[PDB]
């Protein structure tokens, strides 16, 4: 029996009309959605554009050159034995490239969400008025009004506007670009000499090459999330809690996606099955989505005018079939259909893909077959929301339901099950390779240091666009934490000058800490924090869920920040939900404050609380 949600849905009027077929040479025919995966010309053009964006921001020549510098920095961290990140090994270098790019995009998205919270909290009175006065308008229209009363940097919710507002660092990672020119299948036969091991360390196995050719990261902008967050929000606190709840789920999926590459298994590929010789009025489509950043998959079937879907777990497969247990059913889907198979990479999460599938199922009678095909493929392949305003709102309402506490899917249960299954796979693959080949060969190809995106020791390069009296400001957001333990932070600063005086500022709820290091080309430890099982830390006597680090350098060239956990495979923290975020509230308004290194005296350095300063002039104490 298909799952039936009692969600209220707006009526949908199709462009095709009562006869459910568009007329030739009409304005509606020109604005109709059309298939992108099925059409070869579009599926080729979009891959080329996706590759171009990756090479613009991340150049292989630059990343190959920075390997020597990055290896030295990781060595200088002085990690314990068994926790060292050796970038001289090819597999470790390849995994670091994937990890560093994925973390930078996740960090930037988290940074923008933090600023968006600050603008909402500053304008709480106006925001509260909008939410309660305007409850009948569409979710997209509510987002436009909310982004206007607050002085948001990105005030556009349209797809074209979001693309323009997005900058380098949030571009999805194109997997095939990373794994280009890397040697595969180096063969040393029964040799344990140092020369043979050196050659062995320079190559990767075929499995890692296959994993990278099927990888494409998904990072959701805050402007995308504000529409689901404001569908039923009544107060500003509820809206902020919804925004934080969604990004908690999103971040947890990103860590799982990186964990898939670390284990020795190959990741499945999303594909579409179409008839070999399509016949008019007898066509069918089958869509199989294996999201890399997720714990659940989707199978959608379009036979006639009927839409049927199934949600299957990506863990526990016996290798006899590519589908796990079914968690939510929406009809009967036949995955044994015979036809041409087309491979694609999804640009939306499982929660986003399912929301449109539920909305499309309710609109099957009111929408033509072509509209269902066009709207689904555009969103899966290009993250393009449907132009039908009523259908778009229905998708956002379902998106809120799948994330709320009353979701039909228990996301926490499935995410935890996926972590346990992935850990077992790594042990099985390592043990199997430890028998067939040596322990040394097993360590090269399956490193134990790389576990998940927010556990492995990773670096994040900082970009600087703000200059205060000659000092460039580099910003890094410490936290939030999905793991508990002891975490160390280090900063690497490269400057053209021979001798340089650079400063670091750590901002909390009440006061900030200012440090001076004056050491170049070597990591310098700035902060050591202890995170409890609830993900909060005690920074100068108060509980903090996140902090802000600002680095000031004169004539800077590159500033890197290293994040390090004391023990490998740090225990995880249960993912926060809406109730958890509402219960405890932290003020982030102080992250906007800045200091001027040039006008700094010796007494101003150290830990100082806000009451010691005047309004403004946070550099100099009274």
């Amino acid at each position: 029996q298909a799952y039936s949600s009692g969600l209220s849905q707006n009526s949908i009027i199709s462009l095709t009309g009562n006869d459910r077929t568009v007329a030739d040479g009409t304005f509606n025919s020109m604005i109709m959605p059309r298939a992108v995966i099925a059409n070869e010309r579009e599926h080729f053009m979009k891959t080329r554009i996706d590759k171009i964006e990756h090479d613009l921001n991340r150049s292989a020549k630059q990343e190959m050159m920075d390997r020597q510098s990055l290896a030295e920095d990781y060595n200088a961290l002085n990690l314990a034995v068994g926790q060292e990140i050796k970038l001289d090994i090819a597999t470790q270098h390849q995994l670091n490239r994937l990890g560093s790019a994925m973390y930078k995009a996740d960090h930037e998205r988290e940074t923008e969400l933090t600023d968006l919270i600050n603008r909402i909290r500053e304008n709480e009175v106006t925001v509260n008025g909008i939410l309660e006065n305007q409850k009948a308008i569409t979710a997209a229209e509510r987002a436009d009004l909310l982004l206007e009363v607050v002085a948001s940097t990105a005030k556009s919710v349209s797809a074209a506007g979001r693309a323009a507002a997005d900058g380098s660092g949030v571009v999805p990672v194109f997997g095939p670009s990373v794994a280009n020119g890397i040697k595969v299948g180096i063969d040393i036969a029964d040799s344990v000499a140092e020369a043979a091991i050196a050659v062995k360390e320079s190559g990767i196995i075929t499995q890692l090459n296959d994993v990278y050719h099927a990888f494409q990261s998904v990072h959701v902008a805050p402007n995308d999330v504000i529409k689901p967050a404001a569908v039923v929000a009544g107060t500003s606190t509820e809206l902020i809690g919804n925004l934080q709840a969604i990004y908690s789920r999103l971040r947890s999926h990103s860590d799982i996606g990186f964990k898939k590459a670390t284990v020795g298994d190959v990741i499945p590929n999303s594909y579409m099955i179409k008839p070999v010789n399509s016949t008019e009025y007898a066509s069918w489509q089958l869509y199989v989505i294996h999201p890399v950043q997720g714990s659940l998959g989707l199978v959608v079937q379009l036979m006639g005018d009927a839409l049927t879907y199934n949600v299957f777990a990506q863990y526990g497969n016996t290798s006899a079939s590519e589908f796990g247990k079914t968690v939510l059913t929406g009809g009967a889907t036949n995955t044994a259909l015979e036809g041409t198979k087309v491979k694609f990479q999804t640009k939306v999460t499982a929660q986003q893909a399912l929301a449109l599938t539920m909305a499309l199922k309710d609109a099957a009678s009111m929408l033509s077959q072509g509209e269902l095909i066009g709207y689904f493929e555009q969103y899966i392949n290009l993250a393009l929301e449907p132009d039908n305003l009523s259908l778009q709102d229905n998708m956002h309402k379902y998106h809120h339901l799948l994330t709320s506490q009353n979701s039909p899917i228990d996301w926490n249960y499935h995410d935890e099950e996926m972590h346990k299954w992935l850990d077992s796979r790594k042990t099985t693959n390592y043990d199997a390779m430890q028998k067939k080949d040596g322990t040394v060969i097993a360590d090269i190809h399956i490193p134990k240091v790389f576990n998940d995106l927010r556990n492995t020791t990773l670096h994040c390069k900082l970009e600087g666009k703000q200059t205060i009296a000659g000092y460039t400001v580099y910003e890094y957001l410490i936290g939030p934490w999905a793991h508990y333990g002891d975490i160390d932070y280090s900063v690497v600063v490269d400057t053209l000058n021979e001798e340089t005086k650079w400063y670091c500022e750590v901002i909390g709820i009440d006061g900030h800490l200012l440090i001076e290091k004056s050491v170049q080309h070597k990591p310098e430890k700035i902060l050591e924090l202890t995170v409890n099982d609830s993900g909060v830390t005690s920074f100068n006597g108060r509980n903090h869920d996140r902090l802000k680090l600002k680095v000031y350098v004169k004539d800077s060239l590159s500033v890197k920040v290293f994040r390090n956990w004391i023990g490998i495979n740090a225990p995880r923290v249960k993912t926060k939900m809406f109730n958890d975020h509402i219960g405890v509230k932290y003020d982030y308004s102080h992250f906007d404050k800045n200091i001027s290194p040039a006008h700094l005296t010796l007494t101003d350095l150290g830990w100082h609380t806000w009451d010691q300063y005047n309004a403004g002039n946070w550099t100099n104490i009274k």
Binding site: Q1, S4, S5, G6, L328, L401, N406, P408
Partner: protein, 299 residues
């Protein structure tokens, strides 16, 4: 766990196994037809200011000419109908009507003994069982409309299982506040005021949140095969009349407020398909009884 059941569904006493053949079924149909003529003749006597129409119909019913100073009770036909009614209700009631008397009375008028020509709708709500956790309280009141009051005192939300049986056709559930209900091993839907249910779908689970009590009103409809002459209003009036006169006062029997409750209770018992056939004949007999006494009253 705590179990709650409808009061009227509990312990249906066995129905009689006599006077259920074709000859007896013809006698009940004949009595109903003749009783209807008796009540119409009395109306005609009032409008014509003449006793001829009533004496004319009483002679056919009672095989005797009415005489002054003798109470008009219906003759031998009334004696047979009243005692046959008692036998239908309970198996402990005696069978005291001879077969010669049944055959003679069944020949008075030509009519079929068919009891499956038509259908009727009965509104008793069968709630076989309601299973609840430890920290919750469940109360069921009413038969035509059943109100189930549930209060949760525990820390978290509890699940209450509803069993409506297999006989009822449709059950409509209306709640004081929106609530979630779904079948076994099915994801819960959004909160809704009303639910239309098929009792054959299986046990139903209701989420009871912590806080103010939730009251669910239940209405049910079932189809039972009845003869074309069946009239629900006349049957119900006869049931109350038979109770007042004490014909249903038998040892080890259960008492019901309405014929709707009586027929549904017997349907849900074991071998209920066989019991419901006897109850249908009783309903037609009660219709004849109601029309007979209203024509011939006693102060």
């Amino acid at each position: 766990a705590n179990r709650a059941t409808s009061a009227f569904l509990d312990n249906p006493h066995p129905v009689g196994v006599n006077y259920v053949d074709e000859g007896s079924r013809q006698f009940v149909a004949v009595a109903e037809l003749l009783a209807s003529k008796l009540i119409d003749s009395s109306r005609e006597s009032d409008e014509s200011n003449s006793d001829v129409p009533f004496v004319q119909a009483y002679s056919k019913f009672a095989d005797d000419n009415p005489r002054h100073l003798r109470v008009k009770t219906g003759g031998k036909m009334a004696n047979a109908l009243t005692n046959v009614i008692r036998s239908y209700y309970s198996i402990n009631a005696p069978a005291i009507v001879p077969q010669v008397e049944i055959d003679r009375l069944a020949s008075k008028a030509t009519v079929s003994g068919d009891m499956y020509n038509s259908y009727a709708i009965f509104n008793s709500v069968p709630i076989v069982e309601v299973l609840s956790p430890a920290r919750t309280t469940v109360s069921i009141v009413g038969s035509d409309r059943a109100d189930v009051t549930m209060l949760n005192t525990g820390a978290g939300a509890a699940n209450i299982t509803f069993n409506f049986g297999q006989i009822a056709e449709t059950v409509i559930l209306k709640g004081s506040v929106p609530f979630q209900l779904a079948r076994l091993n099915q994801p819960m839907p959004a909160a809704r005021f009303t639910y239309k249910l098929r009792p054959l779908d299986g046990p139903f689970i209701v989420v009871l949140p912590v806080g103010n009590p939730l009251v669910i009103s239940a209405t049910a409809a079932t189809r039972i095969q009845v003869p074309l002459a069946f009239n629900k209003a006349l049957v119900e009036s006869g049931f109350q009349t038979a109770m007042n006169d004490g014909l249903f006062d038998i040892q080890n029997v259960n008492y019901y407020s309405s014929f709707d409750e009586f027929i549904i209770s017997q349907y849900h018992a074991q071998d209920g398909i066989n019991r419901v056939s006897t109850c249908v004949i009783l309903g037609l007999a009660l219709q004849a009884y109601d029309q007979m006494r209203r024509a011939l009253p006693v102060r």
